[PDB]
Design a protein around this ligand. Structure first.
Ligand code: A1EKZ
Ligand code: A1EKZ
Lengths: 183, 183
């Protein structure tokens, strides 16, 4: 209740006013005081880190029922995942704008980064089969995610403003992402 | 005086509050009335179209003194231009964030799109020398610019937050852009 009301309030605030979102206004619009929100998340970095995983799991539950592991070709599996992310972002923009801020933020730990891989081995397995090895390194992985989500957000924006041509924007966006970020 | 103040307020407002920026808040931040603004831009689309050209000409003057025309290899000339844009954006974040909104906006006419090409034949010639044919077509050109400026914005953001690795972000950003947007 109040922990996910905070998680949904943090989503709204971080998507709008950035990750420099006040702990006060995240609390106040979740119908609580600032004191309330810090015994469920010790620090603002702990709120960031589990919201990122919460949003990550929300993206995966939108997809795994439609997910078909028959595909062995990395590019066709990435395309299904790419198509699903864009649709996920179009349906709930705040969840996308928030996860884009959290993914490229310094506050993320590798218990956030190694749980995110354990939570979703299929993506891990896929990344470890196509993505450029430099965008998997601890040093530049966040940058790849930033490139990543920049190409996706641009694809969303043209797909939502020009719905009649959305399908071509998804394909073009995917191909630009694919040759940019894979071997 | 007043029109360059309108253009600089429009630069601030469109980069900050998006391209849905009120003529009210553009005017009030230029120290003028709402009436005065429409004697320098007939319509808000004229403000958009003339700000885009103003910002385009500002970006090119940051580069043309350092521009070396010796190089005939497209990738080395695009890298100098890419390196120049990133530095331009780091020095003027509002001017970059604004031109990103204007470049992907429906309000831009071809009379702006043909001025941008006549004003900068080297960019046109270089674009007409390496870029994928579909990202130059009238239909998906704005999309190419968006993918474009999305990769650049991600490069700026990681370069400004992690300065010690900035040089690596510029090269990686450029190469990811290059294989994404060229043949
Ligand atoms: C490094 C840049 C890419 C991270 O993308 C990808 C992932 C992936 O695991 O993405 C992580 C992610 C982080 C934040 C939001 C959404 C996804 C997995 C497989 C991928 C296959 C091809 C391209 C991109 C892939
Ligand atoms: C299709 C997107 C490309 C826009 O980049 C480019 C230009 C160029 O002239 O881009 C125009 C521009 C538009 C908006 C803001 C800034 C520049 C010229 C040559 C290029 C060569 C390689 C890559 C990109 C290039």
């Amino acid at each position: 209740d109040k922990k996910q009301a905070l998680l949904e309030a943090a989503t709204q605030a971080i998507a709008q006013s950035g990750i420099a979102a006040s702990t006060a206004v995240i609390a106040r619009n979740a119908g609580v005081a600032e004191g309330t929100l810090f015994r469920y998340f010790a620090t603002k970095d702990e709120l960031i880190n589990t919201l990122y995983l919460h949003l990550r799991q929300d993206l995966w539950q939108s997809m795994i029922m439609e997910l078909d592991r028959s595909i062995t070709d990395a590019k066709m599996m990435t395309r299904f995942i790419w198509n699903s992310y864009i649709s996920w972002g179009l349906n709930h923009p705040a969840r996308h704008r928030a996860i884009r801020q959290l993914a490229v933020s310094e506050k993320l730990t590798k218990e956030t980064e190694q749980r995110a891989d354990d939570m979703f081995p299929e993506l891990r397995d896929l990344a470890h089969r196509s993505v450029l090895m430099v965008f998997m390194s601890d040093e530049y992985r966040a940058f790849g995610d930033g490139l990543x989500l920049a190409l996706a957000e641009t694809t969303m924006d043209f797909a939502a403003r020009d719905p009649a041509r959305a399908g071509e924007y998804i394909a073009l966006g995917f191909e630009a992402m694919w040759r940019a970020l894979t071997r």
